[PDB]
């Protein structure tokens, strides 16, 4: 829904002749998806990594603590891939990561 | 490239042509090591460890029986070249461990 009003507002802005960056601000969301989080860890953009404790198959996340230790990323194993899914509006999330937050946080 | 002699036999035989230098075909880049591939392989190596036959070759090389390690590596792998490369990389592993310690 929020994406729908955002695209409608950007459509009105581009109708009256303004860029989408003029009406939309820089987003700050929780990064998720295993390949995305692995890429962020490898590029040292992630500031904090949370890894679910019950990923089946376990080979998807068995290297993530060692990768975080090599790249100097603060990582933590937490209980509940469904608990992370409630964050990321999914049923299941194997790993989530914070790259940047707002100035208030 | 070396110029051909223009004869039917001997060394550098063949019809004389102006040979070209050509840009290397990207299909021939296979076997070159990439930075990401090196990083991933090193991380997976330190995560997983060694095989039992690799540990046997490691302790043979620690004892100094190079010929016995080569023979055991050939018996385990199958070919002399693969055995030699395996012994070389395990000797590199031993050297890295001893320079760490």
């Amino acid at each position: 829904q929020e994406k729908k009003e955002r695209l409608l507002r950007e459509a009105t802005a581009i109708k009256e002749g303004k860029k989408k960056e003029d009406v939309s601000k820089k987003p700050y969301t929780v990064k998720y998806g295993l390949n995305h989080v692995v890429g962020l860890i490898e590029n040292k953009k992630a500031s904090l990594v949370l890894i679910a404790n019950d990923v089946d198959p376990i080979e998807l996340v068995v290297f993530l603590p060692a990768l975080c230790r090599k790249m100097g990323i603060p990582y933590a194993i937490i209980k509940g891939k469904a608990r992370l899914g409630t964050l990321v509006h999914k049923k299941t999330a194997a790993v989530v990561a914070i790259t940047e937050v707002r100035s208030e946080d | 490239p070396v110029e051909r002699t223009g004869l039917i036999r001997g060394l550098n035989k063949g019809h004389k042509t102006t040979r070209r230098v050509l840009k290397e075909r990207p299909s021939r880049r296979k076997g070159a090591q990439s930075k990401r591939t090196q990083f991933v392989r090193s991380l997976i190596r330190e995560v997983a460890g060694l095989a039992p036959y690799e540990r046997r070759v490691i302790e043979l090389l620690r004892n100094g029986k190079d010929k016995r390690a080569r023979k055991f590596s050939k018996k385990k792998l199958g070919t002399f070249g693969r055995a030699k490369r395996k012994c070389e990389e395990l000797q590199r592993i031993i050297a890295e461990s001893r320079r760490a310690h």
């Binding site: 890429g39 490898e42 590029n43 040292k44 | 990401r36």
Partner: peptide
Amino acid sequence: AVSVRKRA
């Protein structure tokens, strides 16, 4: 940092 490819 390990980069898979150059990023625009």
